[PDB]
């Protein structure tokens, strides 16, 4: 099957069309401005540009399309999908009392955060006083796919989670549905399942098959995990980016409020997650990528630095141990930059190790192997340290681009996760 994945991320958007029979693919991209006063037009136009850059003979073969978007980016629209105010972005927080959400979700629910879609919807409710029932709140992915299939109030149980959805029971609470916000809530499907055929005019304009199906979407981080192709419980993806982000596939859902750990539903499984403030950003405080790699090549992995670092970029750690007061621990500083770098990498390695240990201690399926993403993935010495410390097979992820994972989502759904 030839399928199209669309990734709308934090800095831009990418389209990947893939024939999963010949395993052949094509990828195109657009870049966002740092700031916009009309993000809906930016995203919509980006969608059209992405479609345009894809070769016509690829578009003529695309059978299924899926879209991932940033988690917490929402749009308040009318019944026609027309935005009634500026979107609230993923990284924006709303000055609301979380107690106002208490009767709508369980006590340990991930939606109980000032940056959640639910919190934002409530913020809008307060701002407007009363919201018309014919209106709708849509995730970025929801709205963008709405541009393609024309079905209003449609979402997935990944995006809908922080809107107040409970994927463990597959429903919004009765209280939330019966409330003054219920009519704006979307119909929730499993990511990957067909929502409806592409709109005729869109298909004609972009030379797509009129029978091309538009699927339920997902989030960009989940799509990133889906790119790896890991579908066995105990398999994990480590993102060695600016911050170290761990995602572990598990048969058991786990969560922890203070460390920000929670679990997405993933077919019959659960994707548990945890993010440390430690990461590449701490490394960039001392070395540029070039010098970082050149110095990395000189490290003897059989030695130990004798340094016990906790490489925070600044005050406060979230995961594996929540500590808002913890300062960066980078003393002492050896004269040798090689030993110093080794201390740093050892620290980050400890962060990863203790991270997966933490997820397991919360009840998650024990770790079997690591697929690595992010800029640190190709650091061989670092991978050696991680291998020695963690004790499971570690390799570079086959794919890391969210658009590819979303393409796989369109092609096969979540069928592999049972």
Author numbering: 2 to 419
Copy text from the publication.
Synpcc7942_2462 from the cyanobacteria Synechococcus elongatus PCC 7942 encodes a putative sugar kinase (SePSK), and this kinase contains 426 amino acids. SePSK and AtXK-1 display a sequence identity of 44.9%, and belong to the ribulokinase-like carbohydrate kinases, a sub-family of FGGY family carbohydrate kinases. Domain I exhibits a ribonuclease H-like folding pattern, and is responsible for the substrate binding, while domain II possesses an actin-like ATPase domain that binds cofactor ATP.
We therefore used single isomorphous replacement anomalous scattering method (SIRAS) for successful solution of the apo-SePSK structure at a resolution of 2.3 Å. The amino-acid residues were traced from Val2 to His419, except for the Met1 residue and the seven residues at the C-termini. Apo-SePSK contains two domains referred to further on as domain I and domain II. In the SePSK structure, B1 and B2 are sandwiched by A1, A2 and A3, and the whole structure shows the A1/B1/A2/B2/A3 (α/β/α/β/α) folding pattern, which is in common with other members of FGGY family carbohydrate kinases. The overall folding of SePSK resembles a clip, with A2 of domain I acting as a hinge region. After comparing structures of apo-SePSK, RBL-SePSK and AMP-PNP-SePSK, we noticed that these structures presented here are similar. Since the two domains of SePSK are widely separated in this structure, we hypothesize that our structures of SePSK represent its open form, and that a conformational rearrangement must occur to switch to the closed state in order to facilitate the catalytic process of phosphorylation of sugar substrates.
